[PDB]
Write a protein that binds this ligand. Sequence first.
Ligand SMILES: NC(=S)c1cccs1
Ligand SMILES: [Cl-]
Ligand SMILES: [Cl-]
Ligand SMILES: [Cl-]
Ligand SMILES: [Cl-]
Ligand SMILES: [Cl-]
Ligand SMILES: [Cl-]
Ligand SMILES: [Mg+2]
Length: 346
Amino acid sequence: ERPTFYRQELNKTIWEVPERYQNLSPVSGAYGSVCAAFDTKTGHRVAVKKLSRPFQSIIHAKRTYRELRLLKHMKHENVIGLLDVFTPARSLEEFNDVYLVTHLMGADLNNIVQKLTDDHVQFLIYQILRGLKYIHSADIIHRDLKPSNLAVNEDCELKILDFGLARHTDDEMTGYVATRWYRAPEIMLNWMHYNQTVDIWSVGCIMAELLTGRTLFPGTDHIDQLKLILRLVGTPGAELLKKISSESARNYIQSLAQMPKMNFANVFIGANPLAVDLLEKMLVLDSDKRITAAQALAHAYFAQYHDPDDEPVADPYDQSFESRDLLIDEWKSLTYDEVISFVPPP
Ligand SMILES: NC(=S)c1cccs1
Ligand SMILES: [Cl-]
Ligand SMILES: [Cl-]
Ligand SMILES: [Cl-]
Ligand SMILES: [Cl-]
Ligand SMILES: [Cl-]
Ligand SMILES: [Cl-]
Ligand SMILES: [Mg+2]
């Protein structure tokens, strides 16, 4: 049966939500227009997001469908999942607003990055790689792993956030900005068609920062950041240069004086030698040669947490819709079907 809804004025608009959600209070806009609430059916504090103008254009309608498909698929301890999705509409004809419910995040990794022991670094990076093995097993690329997208609780337990939101703009990536400091060079500079290996570069940047307390590559712009990267890992050899499909980018790279890879034990002074070894296998310029998430879970650095019988993979994820061309009302009807078919977790 359909639940009873009630109305309240929040975040410049009228929110209409099922009675089970009580004590709504606005909560930053990085993940949308969000309120905290108490869910009386489950006893959890939750985040309720009301989508802004979900079906105003073809691009917005497809983005709404993409976010709902991604959140409905993710079922893993180290990844954000969907607790509920609802609309006050009683038919497709009156369908206009979409609301998403997730666990309420308290702190992200920025706040922690506290005096972190090496045991803390082992456990946090282990959980990121466990979640990433699951994400990559469904042929999803995260593209934006960074400390503000990692939720952490009091017991050091971690979840990965940021799925199905708007692609980052050119201006968001300009200058001295954390949204670019964790990006792999081949996607920062559009060297080539990228793949899931970009996410392992991001994990290496995060792990270095937990070990030192400092941003690894805090570039003041794209070019300054590339110079910091190449000083640490060395300039590319002929094998990688061949793979840079952009003739323009390949030509700029060759204008730079050649530099050897640095000694990571002298960069990360005093760190666990096993941590140094793992960083050298993540922060490889040629993405073909980076360690994978599944391979990294078996690295000796994680020996006290690794359990190959408790590192699950995902059900298959059909993303054929991504190459499909549809009208606004066809994306809207697809979204409506996914709202009404949702089944809550056990
Ligand atoms: N798309 C993401 S990650 C979220 C929606 C509502 C809360 S988080
Ligand atoms: Cl209810
Ligand atoms: Cl969750
Ligand atoms: Cl509606
Ligand atoms: Cl960040
Ligand atoms: Cl798949
Ligand atoms: Cl699917
Ligand atoms: Mg993002």
